[PDB]
Paper text:
Next, a variant with 8 of the most promising stabilizing substitutions (S41P, Q89M, Q222I, N167P, L168P, F335P, S470V and S477V), as based on preF expression, compatibility with each other and ability to prevent cell-cell fusion, termed ‘OnlyEcto2P’, was expressed in a side-by-side comparison to a non-stabilized wildtype protein. The refined model has a root-mean-square deviation of 2.7 Å for all backbone atoms compared to the previously solved structure. Several regions are resolved that were previously poorly resolved or disordered, particularly the HRB stem, which shows an extension of the triple helix with additional density for residues 473−484, as well as the 217−224 helix in the helical bundle (HB) which was previously disordered or random coil. S41P, situated at a bend in the extended β-sheet structure between DI and DIII, occupies an intra-protomeric pocket formed by four sequence-distant groups of residues: 40 + 44, 258, 283−285, and 340−341. This hydrophobic pocket accommodates a poorly fitting S41 in the wild-type structure, which is better packed by the substitution to proline. The Q89M + Q222I substitutions stabilize a region of the protein that was partially disordered in previous structures (e.g., PDB ID 8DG847) and create a highly organized hydrophobic cluster, which encompasses three distinct helices. The N167P + L168P substitutions are within the β4-β5 hairpin loop which constitutes a segment of the HRA region that transitions into an extended helical bundle in the post-fusion state and serves to rigidify the loop due to the restricted torsion angles of proline residues.
F is a trimeric, class I fusion protein present on the viral surface in a metastable conformation. F mediates the fusion of viral and host cell membranes through a large-scale conformational change from the metastable prefusion (preF) to the highly stable postfusion (postF) conformation.
Author numbering:
A (entry chain Y), E (entry chain U), F (entry chain W): 1 to 117
B (entry chain A), C (entry chain C), D (entry chain B): 19 to 94, 107 to 244, 252 to 487
């Protein structure tokens, strides 16, 4: 079991920057990777960013270089830093923890939305 | 990739490309088998059959518990991301055991919620119950025979008394013991290491998995994967299970192909290419696929893990279209097909099959040096095989075969007797060569002396 | 034919000749599994458990239907003797699939009588029903649990109400699902291609096959043969089956013999001849018999098809009495018998068996170069083997053995490790020979230059 | 004995020594399965379902009886210690058949007490009954479904009448037929020769074996051993069984060791030593152990007989520490572990495993000529394998490995295809050698002529 | 299924000739052979004659050359022509159709009998 | 089945000699060995002596040479002759018959005891 607690979402102006901070707790020594998923309307949960315990990080083609993800391992927090927000980026962002045995754990997810203008 | 059109010339019929689905991840859920049903007689009438049933459960629950304690081979930083899972133990544990111990130490945090929940499940009568927590998913508990107990035995204790109610309990509980023994009793160490198929436990308890935890083939696959035992309570007779809901993804650029080998004639003797039953591509990769553990949906194979194994032999070159390297082996029985329909036409060795072109009287003879006859709709409008008349498909894509001197030097045997016999023949020839060498060396010594 | 008297000298004990029975033809009959029972509550109380049971049947009936649709690989002259069965399809179908498709297109004419009958079976409550037609045989339909429903659940809905009646349905129907899953769920493609054993369906439904459709071993054989699925109704939850009543004929001039190989001593090491468990003759023919799928009656083996496979090795010469060619292999365990009673006497290798002639003190020693000791009643009146005293039969036909220099050069291994090890030794000797050849060729060059 | 410390250097992890328990003797007891239940309707209402159930029992009891009559292959001094057991018969009987016939003629003296007891069991209604005799142990009889008949069907004949009582009998008895068929129907000749596992019959009849006839693993072993059929009454539908209560002794100076082989690197390719899953010592002896039929208790393996088989290959030299002779074979799949925890440290081939010493960034590289990396707690405090961080045990006994030029020349294949392919290559080289020999002999003739 | 309808039997004078005509209908394209069987009192059904779709015909040793069998494939009829009738030939003659999968189909059978003198 | 009937036990003076005679009956032709076991308080049944049908005899280290066992095969009796009786020898002596198939049969056992002085 891993408790994931997403935070930092809400409405923001387009082109703005936002930081999403997920707090993880539990048997995190068994967690292979921590990261974020997003679910836009009418499509499945796409991967956003992930950090392996080794520090190795990967992103989807929509996210490579554009976003950045970070952790503060002294407190088991995983933070995704959002920048240059687009209407195309509005989705429910789901924090996740993936075990070495490939079990996956999810946060409740935070709504991210941007003004129309 | 596969050169399907050329492989047909040796009776190798690569067919039915299907994609492949792999669970990239598993959603975990917990299932608590509470093996003792509560009774409501208010006088402990059922206790006598409960005691003997407990005395039967021992024969399975104690071996299961003693097996699970061996998975305490990680000794317990933990609770920190990328921290140490635990200290190794004084023994030997293989990678499968280590993976199971890591899965156990991941689930171990449930044990305080287990202690919280058992306080409820010890008291309740309800057969299937779910309990929420601060952790995301509900945890579910099944109290083995409670529906039967409350709906049948609770009335019967009043209507028929302790005698019949007792016999009803004895029969139902010892039946449930035979079911549990069918689930938990065989291969106990593997059952602890690799888990129990969810199919069996659901058959024990008619569990509406989708209703309890959340396409027909995806459901079949969810049944086929193994739930791991994470705890066994010897005092409460309770088994705690980790159910593993797969997140299936269609893997890109993969196809699994079936390959069927028909008999191939060499000089009026039947041979075939003993390729594996399934082959797969992954972009440039080409290998076999151990689909035996996978679920064959109509459009894709759902597998618990990539079943591919690299073809160690010239079989990869054979499948890639370097037909001259295909390994021959002799046919043994009727299990090897003598003919097959292929792309609207027929591919068959007409030496051991009465092939006819436009009527049962016009036999399609093949020369003794041709191994299979490929009968396209351009050749024959109504091919008859062993009397069975079939029209060839006018839109069939079966390419016409101009026969050629296909020589298959890689004669191979599948039977240890054949290999031993021809190795003994080789060894005898080697002894003959050694004798010749000794004689010639002696002659060299004589000529040198002279 | 077999030279039984000489084969004894290598511990090969050919015994128990039995004839063989083959079904030259099959009488077909149709069986319709109507998987939904009708209820008589007059208020749809049972509908809730019927719906969930339908939702379980999907997990088996939809895979079975999707499997059967692949057998639509003959596309549809037909209806004329010696006319075209149909057009081939765009795909690959092996001879087994073609045979199953031909069987399906033979049964397809039933489908209008199927449409006529389902109008009846949709309405009736009776558990087993037969319907006549213009075709010769009655067609029979089984409505899965109707006896239990009408005799137990129909009373219980009044006596105990919808609650208990509902639970009774839930339990009985999900049990019937587990039984159906045991019959229909495994190897679905083979189950469509080759069919389901009638034994299992009769066990599902206590079907008095002889009473429904028309010696104990003939009945066992009729149970062992496979009924083919010919239709699967996804909307009515109905499976239509072709039962195949065999017309058995005793095949003339055939015998199947059991062969038991005892250990044979070579220089105080135990060897045996690894012949197949059964061998058969057909006039002049001599080969093995794959009796595993046959029914062993006391006088004959009833087989679905001729189990004979030609012996590829010198095993045929060995069995024909050319004893010097019999393949030796080393004993591995206690599975190989060290002794046997034969024709009233004993054949045993007394090196690893305390053979005694007329009392436990008179040991029958055999010289190290003799492999088995043949102890006829002329030699010993009361042979004791490992202390077990037995009288030899005074009317025994065990021929007396004057020992001889039987040399068995065909040493053979059954284990891939042994073959690999001695092939590595052969390859190393071959490398030594190649090195010698290079050295001698160099010497030839030097002598020529000089 | 095993050189465990050196075997680790080739990834062979000999582990978990357990003793072995063998039944030096068996206490015999008799069990009479009386397959027909008595009814108490006083009007023969149940007779109709009894008759059809008898007509089903025929399908199993007649084959079982006809099988047992073949065990009349000892013809009948007897009744005297060290006297003749009987006369041999005109046929062939292997040592297994002879042992079963001897067991039958030992039990044959019961048959007069059988005749005495059946007079009782024909009349009684009680489900499980024991009868004393002049022979020491009580003999027990089980009347198949008597509890269900007297407690449920005897009331129902009055409460619901002949119709429902009849259906209840039909269902219960045909279920009992399916259970009996699962016990008695398969491999009937082996089932007569070797017997039936007591586990199955007890599951048929919930038999409290210890209560009926007299540690959990000893009880499991008592369930695993086979009870021999000693009589089959075709008229009374009764099967008489010999239960065999083992007298287990801990065998001295024996240990069974598990051996797990991890992948061993040769030049970036994965190999392993294909040793048997278990090995055993008996003082100086060293061999494999076929533990598959044994019960694995936590401290010892309880086996029906000594499972040891002598290792025929250099495998004995390999296990004895002559590491250079260990047979290599190539890895095929994920079934071979790539790493293992060993004695508090880790033994792994770090070429196909990301081994890290004190953090996921410090990879433990191994040179291409070293096959496994042995990571002791002196080397690494927190070894990480594939990201999984574990502390090494500070009290671990994993000996430090100074690497060495371990050359394993015994390359071996497990697959007949590999052996056939490299034997064909050897045969082709042999043909090349023969051609060279013919050419050189011709040259010798020419030089001699000149 | 194949409907077989036998016809042409009855009483006839000994030494006479008779023609038995069986009408077949159904999925006859799947039928390997059409022919006739006979069942005399106290013995099993003996084969009389059969025609394979290829025209190949076989007979029992009691029937070789003696009898002749024929078809009119334009109407799916199989006819057995009986000649030189003996008391030994009286039996119920059963028409049959044999499938490629070796299923066998039978007519109702026609009684054939001969005068005592 | 083999009926074993032990006899000849009871109290005896220490240092004395005693003869224990077991009568066996039944299918003794199937019996591999006849002999005696003893059970002293607080320990399992130890082997005392056994005779194989071949005459070969064995004893435990406590019994080798000390005791002697005998049979009269004309009447199926197996006799153990006890001598130099010690306090350490008091136990229930169980006669046994062991089959070739390793089944074991036991007598009811006879109490053997010695005076304290």
């Amino acid at each position: 079991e891993v408790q994931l607690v997403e935070s930092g979402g809400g409405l923001v102006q387009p082109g703005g920057s936002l930081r999403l901070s997920c707090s993880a707790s539990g048997s995190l020594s068994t967690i292979k990777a921590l990261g974020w998923y997003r679910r836009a309307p009418g499509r499945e949960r796409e991967l956003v960013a992930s950090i392996t315990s080794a520090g190795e990080t990967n992103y989807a083609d929509s996210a490579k270089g554009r976003f950045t993800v970070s952790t503060d391992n002294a407190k088991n927090t995983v933070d995704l830093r959002m920048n240059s927000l687009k209407p195309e980026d509005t989705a429910v962002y789901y924090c996740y923890a993936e075990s070495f045995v490939l079990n996956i754990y999810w946060g409740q997810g935070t709504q991210v939305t941007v003004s129309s203008g | 990739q596969i050169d399907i059109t050329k492989l047909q010339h040796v009776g190798v019929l690569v067919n039915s490309p299907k994609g492949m689905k792999i669970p990239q991840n598993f959603e975990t859920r917990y299932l608590i088998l509470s093996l003792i049903p509560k009774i409501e007689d208010s006088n402990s009438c059922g206790d006598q059959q409960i005691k003997q049933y407990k005395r039967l459960l021992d024969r399975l629950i104690i071996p299961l518990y003693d097996g699970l304690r061996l998975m305490k081979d990680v000794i317990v930083t933990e609770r920190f991301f990328g921290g140490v899972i635990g200290t190794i133990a004084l023994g030997v544990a293989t990678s499968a055991q280590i993976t199971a111990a890591v899965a156990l130490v991941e689930a171990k945090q449930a044990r305080s919620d287990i202690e919280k929940l058992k306080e409820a499940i010890r008291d309740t009568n309800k057969a299937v119950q779910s309990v929420q927590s601060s952790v995301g998913p509900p945890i579910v508990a099944i109290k083995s025979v409670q529906d039967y107990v409350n709906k049948e035995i609770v009335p019967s204790i009043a209507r028929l008394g302790c005698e019949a109610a007792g016999l009803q309990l004895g029969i139902a509980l010892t039946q449930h013991y035979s079911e549990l023994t069918n689930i938990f009793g065989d291969n106990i160490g593997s059952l602890i290491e690799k888990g129990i198929k969810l199919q069996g436990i659901a058959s024990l308890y008619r569990t509406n998995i989708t209703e309890i935890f959340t396409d027909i083939y995806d459901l079949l696959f969810t049944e086929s994967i193994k739930v791991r035992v994470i705890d066994v309570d010897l005092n409460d007779y309770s088994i705690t299970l980790q159910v593993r809901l797969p997140l299936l993804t269609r893997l890109l650029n993969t196809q699994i192909y079936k390959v069927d080998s028909i008999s191939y004639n060499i000089q009026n003797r039947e041979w075939y290419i003993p390729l594996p039953s399934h082959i797969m591509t992954k972009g440039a990769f080409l290998g076999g696929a151990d689909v035996k553990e996978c679920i064959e949906a109509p459009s894709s194979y759902i597998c618990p893990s990539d079943p591919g194994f690299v073809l160690n032999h010239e079989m990869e070159s054979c499948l890639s279209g370097n037909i001259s390297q295909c390994p021959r082996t002799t046919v043994t029985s009727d299990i090897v097909p003598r003919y097959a329909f292929v792309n609207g036409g027929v591919v068959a060795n007409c030496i051991t099959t009465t092939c006819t072109c436009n009527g049962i009287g016009n036999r399609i003879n093949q020369p003794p040096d041709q191994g299979v006859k490929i009968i396209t709709h351009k050749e024959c409008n109504t091919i008859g095989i062993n009397g069975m008349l079939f029209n060839t498909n006018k839109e069939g894509t079966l390419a016409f075969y101009t026969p050629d001197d296909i020589t298959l030097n890689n004669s191979v045997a599948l039977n240890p007797i054949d290999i031993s016999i021809e190795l003994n023949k080789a060894k005898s020839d080697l002894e003959e060569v050694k004798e010749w060498i000794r004689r010639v060396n002696q002659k060299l010594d004589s000529i040198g002396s002279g």
